[PDB]
């Protein structure tokens, strides 16, 4: 049906399911992200591989499966 309200009840559903705990979860995830950032950089060091490369391999693994 009319996609006015579709991607709204799309968005507000998982934002309904996850409207971030203003500090707690909000930062919880930010930290995790930086953790990834550096993990990735040191992995570049250990493997001799590209930072954005490792980045994308991770990304591909998480999303389940993708062309990317």
């Amino acid at each position: 049906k009319i996609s006015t309200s579709d991607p709204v009840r799309q968005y507000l559903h998982e934002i309904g399911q996850v409207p971030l705990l203003t500090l707690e979860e909000e930062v919880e995830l930010a930290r995790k992200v930086e953790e990834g950032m550096e993990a990735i950089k040191k992995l570049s060091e250990i493997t001799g591989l590209d930072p954005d490369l490792i980045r994308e391999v991770v990304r591909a693994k998480i999303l389940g499966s993708a062309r990317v």
């Binding site: 500090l23 707690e24 930062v27 930290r31």
Partner: protein, 105 residues
């Protein structure tokens, strides 16, 4: 204690005595030293139970007469709390020991 009584006596300062009382012992605050006259006049009647949080293991006894002197292990757990802010991290799981140099949060 909740259920128990620690009795210590520093003549001058050195901990001259350290004698504990299981519940069922009747204490008397500042008595005793008329001639050291075995006057921690604590009565032992019936059950002498233990504080449930602090544990009693390691037994020793030097046997003589009507009473034996006993020396044991006394490990009472002190409940002491802390409060986590938004920006605090809980590196430790759901119950584990920690060293003197083993940061927690």
């Amino acid at each position: 204690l909740e259920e128990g009584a620690f009795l210590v006596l520093r003549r001058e300062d050195e901990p001259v005595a350290t004698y504990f009382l299981p519940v069922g012992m009747t204490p008397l605050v500042v008595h005793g030293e008329i001639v050291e006259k075995g006057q921690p006049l604590a009565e032992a009647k019936g059950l002498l139970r233990m504080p449930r949080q602090v544990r009693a293991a390691q037994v020793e006894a030097e046997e003589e007469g009507e009473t034996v002197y006993l020396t044991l292990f006394l490990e009472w757990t002190e409940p002491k709390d802390y409060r986590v802010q938004p920006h605090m991290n809980v590196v430790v799981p759901e119950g584990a020991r920690v060293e003197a140099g083993d940061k927690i949060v």
